[PDB]
Amino acid sequence: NEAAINQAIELHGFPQRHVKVGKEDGAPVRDNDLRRVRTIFDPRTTDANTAYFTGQDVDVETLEAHNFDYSAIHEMDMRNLTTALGLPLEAGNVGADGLGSGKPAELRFALLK
Amino acid sequence: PDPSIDEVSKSDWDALTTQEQDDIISQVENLSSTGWVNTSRERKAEAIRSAIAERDTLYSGNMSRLPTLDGDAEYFTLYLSAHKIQLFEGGEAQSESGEGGSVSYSTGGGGEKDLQKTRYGRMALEYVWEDNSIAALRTY
Amino acid sequence: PDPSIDEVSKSDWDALTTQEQDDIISQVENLSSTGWVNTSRERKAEAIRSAIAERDTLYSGNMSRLPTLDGDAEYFTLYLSAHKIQLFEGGEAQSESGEGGSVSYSTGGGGEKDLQKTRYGRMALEYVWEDNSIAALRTY
Amino acid sequence: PDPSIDEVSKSDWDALTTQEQDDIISQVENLSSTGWVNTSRERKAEAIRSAIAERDTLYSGNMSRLPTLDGDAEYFTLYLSAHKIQLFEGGEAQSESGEGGSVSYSTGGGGEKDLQKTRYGRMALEYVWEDNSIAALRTY
Amino acid sequence: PDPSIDEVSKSDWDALTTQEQDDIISQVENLSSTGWVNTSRERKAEAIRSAIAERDTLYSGNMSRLPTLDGDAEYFTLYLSAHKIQLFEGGEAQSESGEGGSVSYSTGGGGEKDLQKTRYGRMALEYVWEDNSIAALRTY
Amino acid sequence: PDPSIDEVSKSDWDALTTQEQDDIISQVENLSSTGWVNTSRERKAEAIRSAIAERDTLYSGNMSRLPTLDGDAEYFTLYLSAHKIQLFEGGEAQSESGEGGSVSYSTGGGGEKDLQKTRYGRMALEYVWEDNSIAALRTY
Amino acid sequence: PDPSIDEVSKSDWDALTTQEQDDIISQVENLSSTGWVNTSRERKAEAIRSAIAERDTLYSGNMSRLPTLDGDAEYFTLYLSAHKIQLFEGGEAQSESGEGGSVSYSTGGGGEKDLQKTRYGRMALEYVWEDNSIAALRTY
Amino acid sequence: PDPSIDEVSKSDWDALTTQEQDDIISQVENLSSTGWVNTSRERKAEAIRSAIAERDTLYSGNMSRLPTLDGDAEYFTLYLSAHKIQLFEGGEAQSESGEGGSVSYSTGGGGEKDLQKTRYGRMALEYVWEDNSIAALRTY
Ligand SMILES: [Mg+2]
């Protein structure tokens, strides 16, 4: 699950630029034509305040970073692992509501001792 | 044909003997039952030469590393030749009439584009992804 | 036919004897009541050769591991041949008239694409998923 | 017929005696008042053979465990044969005229697909879920 | 008729005497003013046999426990027979003209489907829920 | 008529004397200025018998406890009979022409359904809630 | 031609000797079966000179570093010349009629723009990205 | 022409010798196969003078510092002249008929605006950004 999150953050945690070229139902654009467009829009040589000027038939779309709750997957994984190893949840740098207080706290720390 | 039309570029076509050209012209004429017999050999040569040139310039290269001419290159160049000869003949006839009767053909104008405008160009389009934009590239 | 049209590639068609080509040509002629008798043997041979080449290049390979030619390959190639012979004859005739009477056939112009444009091509499309995009792949 | 058209595959049709084939051809001719009498016995055999082959390849297998040929298989193959003979005769006639009067039939043009394009094909479609996509599967 | 058309399956039709069949054929002929007199007895038998088979295969079984043939089964099979005879005789005439005058009928073209395409099929549809999907099931 | 058409089921119609049937046939003929005189007595009997059977099977029962035949049952069955005789005569005539002049009628094609398709069927629909779905039930 | 039409600017065309111009004019005449023989030599020269000037002014420069004339420049200038000659001849004929028969051509009217309006202009558009706006720039 | 039409303003045109004007008129007459020979020299002078004046007043200045006449100024003024002569001759002829036969030209009606309404005006529009509004300014 940890490896799966790392790979998912790499692919989906960050937005990515999608430049679409040519008019819809218009003239086709070949790989050698896209190589030139790639040279203009290259994220390697782009900077924060670059501006773009185009004809109507160039679209700078974006793949948004697709939200997923990797924090909750981490909390679930850590809860599984700590409880399997008989440690309290707190040992894994993860916490839970209410369980830090009163008789709920007293029980789990009594069990540990 | 001994040299085939897909083996021949524009510069090669110019270098062919009269017989090698007439052998390819003869092949293109097989794409009509009329063979366009009332058009000069030079109209047919110009249609073939410009089909060869248009293949090599407009329907060449790659899209997502796929070849842009997906179909058989021989019959693509022949249909593109036949298309041009039919446009030199004034276009695709929709209705014909005379002393000996009348006929009308299922045609319907097609779309607006060049190759859509004749039966030969409609055949040719299927060889070249129907002029669709399948190309894709990455950054590295 | 002894070699069947589905057993023959473009290179094989060229290698066939005149008789066993004529055997296949004769089979294609059975797809019209007129047999296209006023078209030369060479028009028919070109239509068949280009139907074979077009099958092997445009209607070959797989979609989601399904074969792209799902129907019977013999009758697909024959209908694709008949489609081409009919386009060499002009279009599909929508109306005919003369000294001996008149008829109009129900066609509706069809869609814009090549195979939609005659009855034989409409038949051929059913063999090839009606030109639909069913293909799928995974990563591993 | 002694062997019925639904009991016969493509390989079986080729193995039948002339009389067994002519008995099935005779049955298909009962689907038109004209019997297509001016269309040769070999056109009719090709229409039937390609109807049999098309049934076994395009209208075979299951959707959601239901058989894809839901109707009677004899009459489905006969209508599919009659559909093909009618397309070998040109299209479906929408208007007819001559020395002895004139008639127009209410075909209405109809849809773009193969089987929609003549009355026999419209009948055939009802036997095969009107070409609908009812199929379903689980993962176990 | 002594055995009625709703009491007869495809196998029973084949077992009937010539007189019992001709008695049913005579009943179907009452559904046209012309009786289709210029269409052979054997076309009419084929239309009836295929109406019987199509009733038993396409218009049989239940939807939501209701029978799918809700109307009178005799007149449903007769209208389905008349529908087929009219299609065997070329389709429903929209206009007629000749030496003796002219007429046009208000058919309106109708919808695309088989039974919508002639007056007898439009009558037949009312007997079978107009081809609607009323079926329902539970889990237990 | 002494037994009225609304008092008679399909079984009763078959049990009537020739004179009792001819008395009802005579009543149905009053629904056309022409009386359909050029159609045989057996066509008219078939139209009435099938109008009776169709009333009792398709236009019978209740919707939301209302009777589904809300109008006068006699005139409903007569219009339903007249609708059938008019469909045995071809369609409803939209235009007529000849030696003695010409006329066109304001039918306008109408809707797709059976009863919409002639003037008598349009009258009959008003008796049966115009084929609307008013039915309702509770659980208890 | 010895100097080819793509090697020649407006200033070069004016500098050519009569034979070198007539050699290019002869090449443009190959793009019609009629050769526009009833249109004077000076009108053909004006069409070519204005095609050359129009190429160099309207179809010159780059879009996203790509050349705006992507196709073969010779055949682009020739089609642009043929387009102009056809407009000097009054436009593209849609129908023709006379003592010797009649024909209609499937033009479909086309779109509103200059090059869309004849077959040669429709061909020329494919050489110049179909007049699309693919240009892009960036701030450094 | 020694003074070219792009080198000449309205004031210059009035100052030209008769021969210098007639040399430019002769150039404009090359843009129609008919030369508009039945329209007087003084109509042609008015068309040219008003094309020159309209260039200098309506198709002059800049958009985003681009020249608003992007094309060749000579051929723009000549097409604008030919447009005016054609509008002095009536409109653009869509159909012609007489003793010697008939023709229809594929004009397609076109858009509502002045230059859209003739083939010459459609050519002229390509020189002037097709009448589009590309202009832009900053504040400082
Ligand atoms: Mg294109």
Side-chain angles (χ1 to χ4, degrees), chain E residues 6 26-37 70-75 78-79 92-93 100-111 116 119-120 122-123 126-128 130, chain F residues 10 38-39 42-47 49-51 53-54 57-59 83-84 86-99 107-115 117 131:
Chain E
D6 59 317
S26 179
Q27 190 180 17
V28 174
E29 290 178 335
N30 294 337
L31 302 185
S32 174
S33 53
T34 68
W36 310 278
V37 286
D70 187 38
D72 175 67
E74 172 187 4
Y75 284 103
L78 299 167
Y79 291 131
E92 181 149 283
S102 181
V103 59
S104 286
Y105 304 100
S106 216
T107 64
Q116 294 173 322
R119 67 207 183 266
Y120 305 112
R122 293 186 293 267
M123 282 188 289
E126 287 280 355
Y127 290 64
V128 291
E130 304 174 24
Chain F
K10 192 212 279 180
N38 297 333
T39 63
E42 267 48 70
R43 270 73 182 172
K44 294 176 191 157
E46 204 77 50
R49 188 175 185 267
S50 64
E54 184 164 322
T57 56
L58 298 189
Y59 305 104
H83 170 71
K84 292 182 174 201
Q86 190 60 53
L87 294 185
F88 299 180
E89 285 272 58
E92 174 152 283
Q94 181 160 351
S95 300
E96 299 178 301
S97 185
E99 188 169 336
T107 64
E112 296 85 353
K113 279 61 179 301
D114 173 33
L115 289 181
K117 200 41 60 85
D131 228 22

Side-chain angles (χ1 to χ4, degrees), chain G residues 10 38-39 42-43 45-47 49-51 53-54 57-59 83-84 86-99 107-110 112-115 117 131, chain H residues 6 26-27 29-37 70-72 74-75 78-79 92-93 100-111 116 119-120 122-123 126-128 130:
Chain G
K10 195 213 284 182
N38 298 327
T39 275
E42 291 311 308
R43 297 183 156 85
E46 204 77 52
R49 188 175 184 269
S50 64
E54 181 160 325
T57 56
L58 300 189
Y59 303 103
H83 171 69
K84 291 183 174 199
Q86 192 63 52
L87 295 187
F88 299 1
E89 284 254 319
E92 182 148 282
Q94 182 158 350
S95 299
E96 301 179 295
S97 185
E99 187 170 333
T107 66
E112 299 77 12
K113 279 58 174 293
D114 173 31
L115 290 177
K117 197 46 57 87
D131 226 22
Chain H
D6 58 317
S26 178
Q27 190 180 13
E29 289 179 339
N30 292 339
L31 304 184
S32 174
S33 56
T34 69
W36 311 276
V37 288
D70 189 38
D72 175 69
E74 172 188 2
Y75 284 104
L78 299 167
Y79 293 133
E92 174 151 279
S102 181
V103 60
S104 287
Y105 305 95
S106 211
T107 74
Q116 294 173 327
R119 67 203 179 271
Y120 304 111
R122 291 185 295 267
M123 284 189 287
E126 287 281 351
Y127 290 65
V128 290
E130 304 175 24

Side-chain angles (χ1 to χ4, degrees), chain A residues 26-28, chain B residues 58-59 113-115 125 130-131, chain G residues 125-126 129-130:
Chain B
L58 299 190
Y59 314 106
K113 280 62 175 299
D114 173 30
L115 290 185
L125 277 163
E130 304 174 27
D131 226 21
Chain G
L125 278 166
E126 288 280 353
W129 308 89
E130 304 174 23

Side-chain angles (χ1 to χ4, degrees), chain C residues 129-140:
Chain C
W129 308 90
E130 305 174 21
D131 226 20
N132 291 301
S133 308
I134 283 154
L137 287 181
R138 247 192 70 167
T139 62
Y140 306 106

Side-chain angles (χ1 to χ4, degrees), chain A residues 58-109:
Chain A
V58 179
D59 297 309
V60 189
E61 301 296 344
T62 175
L63 284 156
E64 288 164 23
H66 297 110
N67 183 71
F68 72 108
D69 197 351
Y70 50 91
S71 301
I73 307 175
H74 273 136
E75 291 170 9
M76 191 203 80
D77 288 339
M78 192 59 71
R79 192 182 316 251
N80 274 59
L81 181 63
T82 52
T83 304
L85 300 184
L87 287 161
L89 178 60
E90 288 67 29
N93 306 110
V94 166
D97 293 355
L99 295 190
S101 185
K103 305 206 172 200
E106 293 173 15
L107 179 77
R108 297 198 326 300
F109 293 97

Side-chain angles (χ1 to χ4, degrees), chain B residues 1-17:
Chain B
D2 192 359
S4 178
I5 195 176
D6 59 317
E7 304 177 321
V8 170
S9 70
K10 196 216 286 182
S11 306
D12 305 316
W13 174 265
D14 292 344
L16 291 184
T17 60

